[PDB]
Design a protein around this ligand. Structure first.
Ligand SMILES: [Mg+2]
Ligand SMILES: [Mg+2]
Ligand SMILES: [Zn+2]
Ligand SMILES: [Zn+2]
Ligand SMILES: [Zn+2]
Lengths: 523, 72, 133, 131
């Protein structure tokens, strides 16, 4: 048999002089005498011939000990989100001096970048091979008409590969230490990646210590993401084949199933975004795993501690304010009381009851469609759960998906994929859910003794001059300090601001009011 | 990255101008020329060489004691 | 007017580093992207004013086709028949921001507030009547 | 159109060596880990009489060495990559090469490793008049 790899595309019919023919199948047949070759001095070697060499069907699945795999499995990809980047290419056919092969033209990534490159290909010469510019034309498909003007706007390839290294470098320098490309029509993209990729044994950066992901041909040196200026080769990408995962028709119809957000403006970045959106759906819109971990990049533990503090405070305050008989917890897979001591009846619900504590954790998938008229006693508590419109009694805390930060990564469909430890995927944000509630207004409830020295009451507890009207912590009157309460108020305010800047929004039943906390205070 | 070059060039010209360099005349013309050329450049390398040529001006004078701020 | 020609220069803009750090922190200004920095505060050197006043050399005497002009002027006028105009007294003009420059040589003694505040309505109407002749 | 050129038994090797950064060491590591060497080389027909000098204009073997189509031996010329000759073309494109029939099963490996002594014009070890 044969393959299409290195399939010649020149239009001349005569074979090559054996001494300049790369293989035993690409010789001419006058020399072919019983599978062997005999030099016939009646004909000499040509001294001018320029045969384009198609570069498709590469097929790379080897096993060498020093070299890392290039196609990774599904689990090794799930672990390394943060590093996924879509990829799509558009093509063009060769015209006059050759025919039968495609050349890369427009490149598109998950970022909304679109590069165009002049058509270039690998030509031969009687002395060597050659990377030169060749003539081409767009595909005769009508929908591909938005490619006709692009054929005179190209760039020399070196500019393109430098731009690519730079775009990747400042997209990923603060997230991963690699890159994995998600792609669909695997073959042609692998073909295109001949232009700017180079593989080889694992290496570490120079003047930095992280693994190296860049190559420079001039100086012959590697680089990480940070220290990579002037370098023009990606040194060890990883890949993934989404269509390999058991999908049927074109990705357009497949994506069209769920995400109604990403339309199709006719470019390549659109295809890249759709591919990545689909890959995120296929692996993450399910239930969240607790065995997957992620490194911290960074500052995150502050956000976590802030969430702890604010949860404790808000729930304690709501209880002491209204004194609910029963606390209908919801969405808690670990029956752990947030406020530690609370005489209120404390339920636990979930749509995923654990093995143990299942007797505590009753199975329950909430939906306002049905359970709207069920828990009309006490109050619920939707900490980070994600349902439709919440019941008029609740204490919801829901992550807004519109904020920008390096922690949450775009997902489907409009909902984004938060990543702290174990990746949480949250649906799109909308207002219809909170039609029964109102934003929790800031406050600070304390209930404990005061400074000291005095350790009694009015008025021997140390006062400093804090004048704020919302630290509801009798002892307090305008001098309102008892040191303890004062710097505690400062700390908690800082924590609240950090939490609510990270993205989380709060809400409370409409009945809430602060004054009754003062009413509690009078002793 | 290139945006960082453009930005630091803006700040450098501001410092020069507030060091009274515009009093002299041909020097200020050259500084303005280099600044406006950097703001319109397209590739990083030649922008960097214009940047060093323009910083040489601030270094050639003894108004700013760099041995102080270079303390990290 | 005076013994030595003045050379005016144009200073460069000012940088708001906090906002730039914010915007690059949230992932903006990527290489090769579409949105970017294209609008700056360009500086000019000495002979900037005169080198721009010199741009009038593109104004040349022009003789117009008198008949077609005399027709299009009528049509243009017809585009303009829904309004109403006419002289008004001094006590009906509306000046927003009476605190701008008053041209030369009046800018040696204050802004437009002064002259609009030191001439009674009689003097203003008299000035109008004067320029009508 | 065009004409096919490589047999399916070469796809992995050719790809993995056309993407590498050091084609020579890549191929050596490929062999050294249980690989099947490259094999649709053009094979000549001659008298096995003449100089032992492999690099020649016309197939000139002895009873032991074996004439091969030169250009189809330079790995660089085979994967369609650039040559490391500082300037600037492969030399084996145009000539014939003669390899000891023993090792002449793998032509490309031999061409990569051994070299012709400049004096005797023959392979260093197969054979050389020098010393
Ligand atoms: Mg498209
Ligand atoms: Mg496409
Ligand atoms: Zn580095
Ligand atoms: Zn060669
Ligand atoms: Zn010798």
């Amino acid at each position: 048999n044969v393959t299409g790899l290195f399939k010649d595309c020149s239009k001349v019919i005569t074979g090559l002089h054996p001494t300049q023919a790369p293989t035993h199948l690409s010789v001419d047949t006058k020399f072919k005498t019983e599978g062997l070759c005999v030099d016939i001095p009646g004909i000499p070697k040509d001294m001018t011939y320029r045969r384009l060499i198609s570069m498709m069907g590469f097929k790379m699945n080897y096993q060498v000990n020093g070299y890392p795999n290039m196609f990774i499995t599904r689990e090794e990809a799930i672990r390394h989100v943060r590093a996924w980047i879509g990829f799509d290419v558009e093509g063009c056919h060769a015209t006059r001096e050759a025919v039968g092969t495609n050349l890369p033209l427009q490149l598109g990534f998950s970022t909304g970048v679109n590069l165009v490159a002049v058509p270039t290909g690998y030509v031969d010469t009687p002395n060597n091979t050659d990377f030169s510019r060749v003539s081409a034309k767009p595909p005769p498909g009508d929908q591909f008409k938005h490619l006709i003007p692009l054929m005179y706007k190209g760039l020399p390839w070196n500019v393109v590969r430098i731009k690519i290294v730079q775009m990747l470098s400042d997209t990923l320098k603060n997230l991963s230490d690699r890159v994995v490309f998600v792609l669909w029509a695997h073959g042609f993209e692998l073909t295109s990646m001949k232009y700017f990729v180079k593989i080889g044994p694992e290496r570490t950066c120079c003047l930095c210590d992280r693994r190296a992901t860049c190559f420079s041909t001039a100086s012959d040196t590697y680089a990480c993401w940070h220290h990579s200026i002037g370098f023009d080769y990606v040194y060890n990408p990883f890949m993934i084949d989404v269509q390999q995962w058991g999908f049927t028709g074109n990705l357009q119809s497949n994506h069209d199933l769920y995400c109604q957000v990403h339309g199709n403006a006719h470019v390549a970045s659109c295809d890249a975004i759709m591919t990545r959106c689909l890959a995120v759906h296929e692996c993450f819109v399910k239930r969240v795993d607790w065995t997957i971990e992620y490194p911290i990049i960074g500052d995150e533990l502050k956000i976590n501690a802030a969430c702890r503090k604010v949860q404790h405070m808000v729930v304690k305050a709501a209880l002491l304010a209204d004194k609910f008989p029963v606390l209908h917890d919801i969405g808690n897979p670990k029956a752990i009381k947030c406020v530690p001591q609370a005489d209120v009846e404390w339920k636990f619900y979930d749509a995923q009851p654990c093995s143990d504590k299942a007797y505590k954790i009753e199975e329950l998938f909430y939906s306002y469609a049905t359970h709207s008229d069920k828990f009309t006693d006490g109050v619920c508590l939707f900490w980070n759960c994600n349902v439709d419109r919440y019941p008029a009694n609740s204490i919801v805390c829901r992550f807004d998906t519109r904020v920008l930060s390096n922690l949450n990564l775009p997902g489907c469909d409009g909902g984004s994929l938060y990543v702290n430890k174990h990746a949480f995927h949250t649906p799109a944000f909308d207002k219809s859910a909170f039609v029964n509630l109102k934003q929790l207004p800031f406050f600070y409830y304390s209930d404990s003794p005061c400074e000291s020295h005095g350790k009694q009451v009015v008025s021997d507890i140390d006062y400093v001059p804090l004048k704020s009207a919302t630290c509801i912590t009798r002892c307090n009157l305008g001098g309102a300090v008892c040191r303890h309460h004062a710097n505690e108020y400062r700390l908690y305010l800082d924590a609240y601001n950090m939490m609510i800047s990270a993205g989380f929004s709060l809400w409370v039943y409409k009945q809430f009011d602060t004054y009754n906390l003062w009413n509690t205070f009078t002793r | 990255k290139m945006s960082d070059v453009k930005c630091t060039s803006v700040v450098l010209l501001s410092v020069l101008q507030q060091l009274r360099v515009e009093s002299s005349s041909k020097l200020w013309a050259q500084c303005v020329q280099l600044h406006n050329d950097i703001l319109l450049a397209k590739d990083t390398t030649e922008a960097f060489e214009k940047m060093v040529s323009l910083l040489s001006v601030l270094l050639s004078m003894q108004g700013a004691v760099d041995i102080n701020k270079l303390c990290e | 007017l005076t013994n030595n020609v003045a050379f005016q220069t144009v200073k460069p803009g000012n940088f708001n580093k906090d906002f730039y750090d914010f915007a690059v922190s949230k992932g903006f200004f990527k290489e090769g992207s579409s949105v970017e920095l294209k609008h700056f505060f360009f500086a000019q050197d000495g002979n900037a004013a005169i080198s721009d006043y010199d741009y009038y050399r593109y104004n040349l005497p022009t003789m117009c086709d008198i008949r077609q002009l005399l027709f299009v002027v009528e049509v243009v006028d017809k585009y303009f028949d829904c309004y109403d105009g006419g002289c008004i007294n001094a006590n009906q003009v509306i000046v927003n921001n009476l605190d701008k420059s008053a041209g030369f040589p009046f800018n040696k003694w204050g802004k437009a507030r002064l002259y609009y505040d030191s001439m009674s309505y009689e003097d203003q109407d008299a000035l109008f009547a004067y320029t009508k002749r | 159109a065009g004409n096919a050129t490589e047999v399916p038994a070469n796809s992995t090797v050719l790809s993995f060596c056309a993407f590498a950064v050091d084609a020579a060491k890549a191929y050596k590591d490929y062999l050294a880990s249980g690989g099947q060497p490259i094999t649709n080389c053009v094979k000549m027909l001659c008298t096995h009489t003449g100089t032992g000098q492999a690099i020649t204009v016309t197939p000139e073997a002895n009873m032991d060495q074996e004439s091969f189509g030169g250009a189809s031996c330079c790995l660089y010329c085979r994967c369609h990559i650039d040559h490391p000759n500082p300037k600037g073309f492969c030399d084996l494109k145009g000539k014939y090469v003669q390899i000891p029939t023993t090792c002449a099963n793998d032509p490309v490996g031999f061409t990569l490793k051994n070299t012709v002594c400049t004096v005797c014009g023959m392979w260093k070890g197969y054979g050389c008049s020098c010393d």
